[model samples]
Target chain A: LPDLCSWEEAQLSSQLYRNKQLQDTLVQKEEELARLHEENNHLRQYLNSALVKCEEEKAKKELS
Target chain B: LPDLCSWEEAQLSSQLYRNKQLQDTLVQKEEELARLHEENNHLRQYLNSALVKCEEEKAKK
Candidate 1:
């Protein structure tokens, strides 16, 4: 173990950590993308519902 | 010199590893946030440019 012990482990570990961080960052980005997509879908649905209500109100006012 | 048993050393190593992983995860999340923000900015700029082009086309038509 004496041969393997050195201050150089810091550099090696940092490289390994950086690789792992890159991988994890990609995964986190995917998760965030998924969340944003879901939010966008929800917003679209809400906007569509509002449009439908507006149309209904306009039609009622015309009929009256 | 074997004051600490092998199992204790293993447990300590694992705990330290878990802490490192958690810290890495947080840093990774921040990086992802930054990357997404950059991408969003780029997309917004592209959309604005496209909108300008669209307006010009509409005016032409």
Candidate 2:
């Protein structure tokens, strides 16, 4: 490794640790977002019949 | 600032820059996630009528 002062090494070490934490949280968040997207799609599937009626109502309201 | 060699300062600078990028991206992602959450809730509001009927159908079937 290159020569670095103790204080500089400490700063570098802290950065590495913090970046690792951010990376871990980012990975977890991505998984969470994926699950939420899956749930959203699943819920959308349940809206088929109701969605038609809702759209119809919306259309009627918009026309007037 | 404390006494550090030029090489040490360089290392520290690189680390600082990297951390800034990570922090910025994290902040942006949080906002993006928040917007997505808002969109999800809005979509759910549309599901109210559909959800009740869907539940009834589900219960019947």
Candidate 3:
């Protein structure tokens, strides 16, 4: 075989290593998104609290 | 040259092709996650709007 064959084989392994890195990064993204997903659900709880308090305050003082 | 040398070369090429496919898939994931990132930003905007309106309603009639 020529020198090119061995050189090309070396390059292939380099990309294989990169593929492993990409796979790892993908998992990291998934974990981050999963955490953010329900963190917003916690945010909605504050939203609910605000609405309830607002309505309660309004109902008590709707003119004499 | 032995048969293993040529055969190993062929197997390496196969993985090289897989590497290309994986690179493409990584781009797809980045795009999708990016979209969800700012979509949540929009969600936060609604959150801000809700807080403001709720506060305003209390302050006003």
Candidate 4:
């Protein structure tokens, strides 16, 4: 192997170990993100339900 | 400041952030791996206990 290539390889593998650690962190963040999305979907359903109720109440009030 | 070259500085902060993120991920993976190992240990303990019970039954018989 070329001298420069060997030097770069050493640096690359060291960085790979670091990158593996970082990717592990990303996986956890992804899991958290999934949880948040689930929560948001639940909240969205509640909001939709509330909006429908409000609309029904407004229609009743208008009729009266 | 000491006469450290700025070329090192140029890569340092980005590398630091990258490393910080990586370390965080490593912690989470390790926590999960630990949990899995604990579960495995529990299973092994249960298996050992079952073997003891079997031996006791054999002794009784």
| Candidate number achieving the greatest lDDT relative to the actual structure | 2
Better of 1 and 3 by DockQ: 3
Per-residue lDDT of candidate 4, residues B1-61 (tens digit)? 2223343444455566777777776677667666655655565565566557655745634
What is the iRMS for every candidate structure? 8.2, 2.0, 2.4, 9.6
CAPRI-wise, candidate 2 is: acceptable
What C-alpha lDDT, on a 0 to 100 scale, does residue A39 get in candidate 2? Answer: 76
DockQ of 3: 0.35
Candidates sorted by DockQ, best first: 2, 3, 4, 1
* Runs of candidate 4 exceeding 4 Å displacement: A1-12, B1-61
lDDT by residue for model 3 (A1-64), tens: 5687677667767867877887788788778777776766676677678778767876887854
DockQ metric for all predictions: 0.06, 0.41, 0.35, 0.08
Ignoring the other chain, what TM-score does chain B have in each prediction?
0.64, 0.65, 0.80, 0.63
For each candidate, the alpha-carbon lDDT, in order, equals 0.60, 0.75, 0.75, 0.61
Cα deviation in Å at residue A63, candidate 1? Answer: 1.8
Sort by lDDT, best first: what order? Answer: 2, 3, 4, 1
lDDT of 3 by residue, B1-61 (tens): 5675677678777877877787787788778778767767877898889878766765645
* Candidate 4 lDDT for residue B48: 69
Model 1 per-residue lDDT tens digits across residues B1-61? 2333444445446655765776677676777667666765665565566557655745634
- lDDT per residue as tens, model 2, B1-61: 2435676678778878888887888887788778778878977887775567756755634
The TM-score obtained by model 1 is 0.41
Residue A25 alpha-carbon offset, candidate 2, angstroms: 1.4
